[PDB]
Design an enzyme around this catalytic site. Sequence first.
Site, PDB file in Angstrom:
ATOM      1  N   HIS A   1     -45.295  50.014 102.170  1.00 55.79           N
ATOM      2  CA  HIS A   1     -45.593  51.446 102.276  1.00 55.79           C
ATOM      3  C   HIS A   1     -46.297  51.994 101.043  1.00 55.79           C
ATOM      4  O   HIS A   1     -46.642  53.183 101.027  1.00 55.79           O
ATOM      5  CB  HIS A   1     -44.339  52.294 102.607  1.00 55.79           C
ATOM      6  CG  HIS A   1     -43.272  52.326 101.542  1.00 55.79           C
ATOM      7  ND1 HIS A   1     -43.432  52.960 100.328  1.00 55.79           N
ATOM      8  CD2 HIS A   1     -42.001  51.850 101.548  1.00 55.79           C
ATOM      9  CE1 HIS A   1     -42.324  52.841  99.616  1.00 55.79           C
ATOM     10  NE2 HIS A   1     -41.437  52.176 100.337  1.00 55.79           N
TER      11      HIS A   1
ATOM     12  N   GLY B   1     -39.636  56.679  93.461  1.00 57.54           N
ATOM     13  CA  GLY B   1     -40.388  55.841  92.549  1.00 57.54           C
ATOM     14  C   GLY B   1     -39.767  54.485  92.318  1.00 57.54           C
ATOM     15  O   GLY B   1     -40.440  53.588  91.797  1.00 57.54           O
TER      16      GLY B   1
ATOM     17  N   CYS C   1     -38.691  52.396  94.480  1.00 53.70           N
ATOM     18  CA  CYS C   1     -39.100  51.448  95.469  1.00 53.70           C
ATOM     19  C   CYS C   1     -39.795  50.257  94.830  1.00 53.70           C
ATOM     20  O   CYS C   1     -40.565  50.448  93.963  1.00 53.70           O
ATOM     21  CB  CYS C   1     -39.988  52.116  96.500  1.00 53.70           C
ATOM     22  SG  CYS C   1     -39.114  52.934  97.801  1.00 53.70           S
TER      23      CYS C   1
HETATM   24  C1  LIG Z   1     -39.216  54.663  97.302  1.00 54.51           C
HETATM   25  O1  LIG Z   1     -38.469  54.753  96.470  1.00 54.51           O
HETATM   26  C2  LIG Z   1     -40.604  55.201  97.039  1.00 54.51           C
HETATM   27  N1  LIG Z   1     -41.084  55.108  95.856  1.00 54.51           N
HETATM   28  C3  LIG Z   1     -42.266  55.523  95.584  1.00 54.51           C
HETATM   29  C4  LIG Z   1     -43.048  56.073  96.555  1.00 54.51           C
HETATM   30 BR1  LIG Z   1     -44.800  56.685  96.139  1.00 54.51          BR
HETATM   31  C5  LIG Z   1     -42.608  56.194  97.816  1.00 54.51           C
HETATM   32  C6  LIG Z   1     -41.341  55.768  98.040  1.00 54.51           C
HETATM   33  O2  LIG Z   1     -40.771  55.863  99.281  1.00 54.51           O
HETATM   34  C7  LIG Z   1     -40.973  57.043  99.962  1.00 54.51           C
HETATM   35  C8  LIG Z   1     -40.316  56.854 101.284  1.00 54.51           C
HETATM   36  C9  LIG Z   1     -39.542  57.860 101.773  1.00 54.51           C
HETATM   37  C10 LIG Z   1     -38.879  57.779 102.937  1.00 54.51           C
HETATM   38  C11 LIG Z   1     -39.015  56.644 103.633  1.00 54.51           C
HETATM   39  C12 LIG Z   1     -38.274  56.539 104.947  1.00 54.51           C
HETATM   40  C13 LIG Z   1     -39.762  55.599 103.130  1.00 54.51           C
HETATM   41  N2  LIG Z   1     -39.893  54.462 103.913  1.00 54.51           N
HETATM   42  O3  LIG Z   1     -40.676  54.624 104.996  1.00 54.51           O
HETATM   43  O4  LIG Z   1     -39.381  53.496 103.746  1.00 54.51           O
HETATM   44  C14 LIG Z   1     -40.455  55.703 101.961  1.00 54.51           C
END
Ligand SMILES: *C(=O)c1ncc(Br)cc1OCc1ccc(C)c([N+](=O)[O-])c1
Lengths: 303, 297
Positions: free
Chosen positions: B41, B140, B142
């Site tokens: 993502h 962030g 992720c």
């Molecule tokens: C996750 O921690 C994260 N970090 C950085 C960014 Br730019 C985006 C991130 O995830 C956003 C996000 C929010 C909700 C969902 C359900 C997801 N996802 O589809 O997994 C991602």
Amino acid sequence: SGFRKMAFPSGKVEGCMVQVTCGTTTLNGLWLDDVVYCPRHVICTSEDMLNPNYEDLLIRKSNHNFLVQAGNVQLRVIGHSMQNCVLKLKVDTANPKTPKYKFVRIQPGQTFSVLACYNGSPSGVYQCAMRPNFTIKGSFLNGSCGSVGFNIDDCVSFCYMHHMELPTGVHAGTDLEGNFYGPFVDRQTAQAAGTDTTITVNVLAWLYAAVINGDRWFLNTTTLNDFNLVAMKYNYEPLTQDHVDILGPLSAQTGIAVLDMCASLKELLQNGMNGRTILGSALLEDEFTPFDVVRQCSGVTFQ
Amino acid sequence: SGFRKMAFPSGKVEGCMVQVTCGTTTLNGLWLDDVVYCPRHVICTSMLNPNYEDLLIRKSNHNFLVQAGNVQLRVIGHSMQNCVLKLKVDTANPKTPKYKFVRIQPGQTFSVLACYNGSPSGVYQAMRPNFTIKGSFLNGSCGSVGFNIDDCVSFCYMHHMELVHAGTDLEGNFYGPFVDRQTAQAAGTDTTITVNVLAWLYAAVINGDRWFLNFTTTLNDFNLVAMKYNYEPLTQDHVDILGPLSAQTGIAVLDMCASLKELLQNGMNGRTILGSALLEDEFTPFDVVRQCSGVTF
Ligand SMILES: *C(=O)c1ncc(Br)cc1OCc1ccc(C)c([N+](=O)[O-])c1
Ligand SMILES: *C(=O)c1ncc(Br)cc1OCc1ccc(C)c([N+](=O)[O-])c1
């Protein structure tokens, strides 16, 4: 979201662990620049720990009685001295992996990460508070002596070296100049750690963390004197205005005045938690500083 | 003496973290040999319903900026494997540890190196029975990874979503029913890891806490109670894995089940066990022995 007892990344300290051997005694050392730091009781035999005379004991020792191992390579010891309760072994090789570092003596209630170590090799990392009575509640086995506690600000602030596991399972040690925290001495006699107390400003920081993360049921006023009158009854550290000022930026971001959170805590002390949890804990947690909470909740990184 | 939730030393993993940017999105990636691994993502814009292969078709190599420290890596290939992107770069990571990718089982534990913008924030230590984890992840994080160590790093988790928290193994296969889209999603009912609580009581006895020792019971008798209290059922495999703990403490596994059954049916009465006023299930039997015997890496 979420809140956890988080330790600092430990790589910068892993590269500084060494194995220090004197006679048959082997423990952990910290290799920074051309100096290795370890507890001075590494020079103590079986019987010597009962009543050591360290000055006399260290006089019986030359440089070649100190065997320092870093992974595989032996280090040449070319000088030794005693500073308070730590031995300093000057080696002929600066550690190539020396991080930027400082030596720090923390205050009761402040936190740090311990890198638990045996035979010079990292075993695990966890977070600790310096209790008001200058013990720490950790996980130390025989052999862990010389493991260090640290904070990271790219600069590693070493604040603790582990010296001794006491009866009652409490733990004690020194700063990196060898000065013990608390009344303890590096002698195998029974030693009293006095009455501990709960770190009040820390509990409040943790309730703020609870609110920041959606855990609000305990939200419900009182005064600094009234609160201090309750806190003293439950063996809580008294709350000073300094502590209220340290909680300022949490008050701002959460929008809850310091005195109101004290009111909520006063109610929690007088009635317990009735089986409820706060942040998944059934007790009131006092090993998070206000700095800790803001760090975790605003995602502060290091390098 | 003492007992702590303890993470692995995180140095070998720290050397593997990089920052990955695609468009406005920046998150963490894992750099092993000449391949960077990160959640797919990273290519999603402001994700309510993404078509990943269509979105990835609009991306070329130079659309992915990979930074390890101050050093920019050059991207010479990109591919999607399940829910993780694999960016091929022209330089092998000099600091690559000996490593494996593994898919842990519910109830197993691991350490997470929480990371933002490619830089380490903190390390802490279970894969819940319902395949979630209860961690500390901000926006962030992720891309941050979970790992066990043996000089070999067993990479087992990558963070993808804050619902509670969820993510994938390092082949991009989600743990649990989740998918990487911003719809509301349900985890199953979460249950307590019975073999772990028992391991924990053994650790309690090892450190002097024995007040809860009591009676015996049967695997079926205990299991009937575990069912009532949302505990995972105990199997003979569980009992066998607790073998070595039974030897050290000299308490038979089935005797320990009886105490746990008493605690389940009586509560704790305001006393504590290893400093906790709840029963704790994020220590495996392996974890208890590693900590209580000082295994190092
Ligand atoms: C996750 O921690 C994260 N970090 C950085 C960014 Br730019 C985006 C991130 O995830 C956003 C996000 C929010 C909700 C969902 C359900 C997801 N996802 O589809 O997994 C991602
Ligand atoms: C401490 O962990 C340690 N590690 C290795 C060795 Br060889 C010896 C160690 O300490 C033993 C010890 C025991 C009791 C006391 C009171 C002390 N001490 O005097 O500090 C040391």
